[PDB]
From a paper:
Inspection of the crystal contacts of Pre-1, Pre-2 and Pre-3 revealed that at position F189 (S2′ pocket) the enzymes in crystal form A as well as in crystal form B have close contact (3.7 Å) with Asn109 of a symmetry-related molecule. A Trp instead of a Phe at position 189 would be too close to this Asn (2.0 Å W189-CD1 to ND1 or OD1 of N109) which cannot adopt a different conformation because of steric hindrance. Thus, Oml-1 and other omniligase variants containing mutation F189W, which is crucial for the broad substrate scope, cannot be crystallized in crystal form A or B.
Author numbering: 1 to 75, 85 to 278
The structure:
């Protein structure tokens, strides 16, 4: 919205905006550090905190959840955001809190979950939660991780590494993989994640880099697609994103390539 970012153009979201599609009547759970609901550039429809030391989901003492929220709305200006707080101010949280946030999102009929987070190990309970959300029809998106490379090893974080999740890596403004962007066969798509200007807490704006902003673009893209195709299943939304991506190089580094929401939203299955 108020801070200009190249990322919205890069994924061809303006083509949907010109068609009149802005993610109307789509519920997106921002599973992160909260959202500063006081920010003039944001609107928050609901939410919940599972961080025992940080009980307000509508404040953000980390900044990432608020930044992610702004990127989702830059891509899908009409999306309904829900602040699902599972990370503290230091950007860490327990998997049980994260799972409680996913469970809340399922119970409250979210259309899209964005998880701008991950750890190097997952759990069976974490996999069961994302698999259940996907079985329930939710589009589940996660940041692939900022762990760079490890030779031929996967560095994709959990829960992005699980097959049911859309694992999002980060490119720069010229579609080059960002040096921090995690890699491996579990990587699904890329999106803009270098120096992305978005909302920060306390009526502020600023650039951040990471797979966190990249995931936000794909969560916004899912909302644009559902506004044009509200009947599409999560299966069909996911297919539309992966099958119409712009190929960028070896799938170990780039997955299917850069999301193209214009192409995805006119995909014929």
């Amino acid at each position: 919205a108020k801070c200009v970012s190249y990322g919205v153009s890069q994924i061809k979201a303006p083509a949907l905006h010109s068609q009149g599609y802005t993610g109307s009547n789509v519920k997106v759970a921002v599973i992160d550090s909260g959202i500063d609901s006081s920010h003039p550039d944001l609107n928050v429809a609901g939410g919940a905190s599972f961080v025992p030391s940080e009980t307000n989901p509508f404040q953000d003492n980390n900044s990432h959840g608020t930044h992610v929220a702004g990127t989702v709305l830059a891509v899908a200006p009409s999306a309904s955001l829900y602040a699902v707080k599972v990370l503290g101010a230091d950007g860490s949280g327990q998997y049980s809190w994260i799972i409680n946030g996913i469970e809340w999102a399922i119970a409250n009929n979210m259309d899209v979950i964005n998880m701008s987070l991950g750890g190097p190990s997952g759990s069976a309970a974490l996999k069961a939660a994302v698999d259940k959300a996907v079985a329930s029809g939710v589009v589940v998106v996660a940041a692939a991780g900022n762990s760079g490379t490890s030779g031929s090893s996967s560095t994709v974080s959990y829960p992005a590494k699980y097959p049911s999740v859309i694992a999002v890596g980060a490119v720069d403004s010229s579609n080059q993989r960002a040096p921090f962007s995690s890699v491996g066969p579990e990587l699904d798509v890329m999106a803009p994640g270098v120096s992305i200007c978005s909302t920060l807490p306390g009526n502020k704006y600023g650039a951040l880099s990471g797979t966190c902003p990249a995931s936000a673009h794909v969560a916004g893209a899912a909302a644009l697609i559902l506004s044009k195709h509200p009947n599409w299943t999560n299966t069909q939304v996911r297919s539309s994103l992966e099958n119409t991506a712009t190929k960028l190089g070896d799938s170990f580094y780039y997955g299917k390539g850069l999301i193209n929401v214009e192409a995805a939203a006119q995909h014929h299955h």
